[PDB]
Amino acid sequence: RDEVRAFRLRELRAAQSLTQVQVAALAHIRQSRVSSIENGDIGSAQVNTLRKYVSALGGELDITVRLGDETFTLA
Amino acid sequence: RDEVRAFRLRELRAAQSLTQVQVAALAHIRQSRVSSIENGDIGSAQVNTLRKYVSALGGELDITVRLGDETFTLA
Questions:
Q1: Any A CB within 8 A of B67 CB
Q2: From the candidate CATH numbers 1.10.260.40, 1.10.1060.10, 3.40.605.10, 3.90.660.10, the one assigned to the domain spanning A3-73
Q3: Which CATH number fits domain B2-73: 1.10.260.40, 3.90.1150.10, 3.40.50.150, 3.90.1230.10?
Q4: Which of A29, A63, A66, A69 to mutate against chain B (most B CBs within 10 Å)?
Q5: What is the CA angle B27-A41-A29, rounded to 5?
Q6: Is there a contact between A75 and B51 if contact means CB atoms under 8 Å apart?
Q7: Which of residues 8-27 of B touch A (CB under 8 A)?
Q8: Distance (Å, rounded) from C-alpha A8 to C-alpha A2?
């Protein structure tokens, strides 16, 4: 469900070995929202929020719409 | 531009003969959001809301984190 997702985000921070608070301020994000996404939430977060989280921990967040044969980019 | 991204979305909707008002009802999303997320405010868009919309256009929204060459899926 979201457990898989949660673990997809939890390890971005674990790899830098930073706490949830360190990151909220490294990415400039409410620690509440930071914790919510680490828990496989994400549906209630601005794309921006999510991007910052991932950028902060050295990744590139790519948002795409796949329709039929081809796909389109949003981020 | 993040306004060309969203204008690509406007055309997907239009090609399927749906007005913003219909799209709204279809994904149970406030019509106010759809106009903006169609005016290019993707960053500000709440993820699930943007999920809800892209599917009322018959699409899969696809969120992944690119690290090195390898990329990992969230949505």
A1: yes
A2: 1.10.260.40
A3: 1.10.260.40
A4: A63
A5: 110
A6: no
A7: 8-9, 12
A8: 9
Q: Which residue has the tokens 């828990």?
A: A39
CB–CB of A43 and B46 under 8 A? yes
Resolution in A: 3.2
Report the DSSP beta bridge partners of residue A71.
A66
Q: Which residues of A touch B72 (CB under 8 A)?
A: 8
Of B9, B48, B72, the CB nearest to A43: B48
Q: Which residues pair with B71 in a beta bridge?
A: B66
Could you tell me the CA-to-CA distances from A10 to A26, A75, B22, B58 in Å, in that order? 15, 22, 38, 31
Experimental method: X-ray
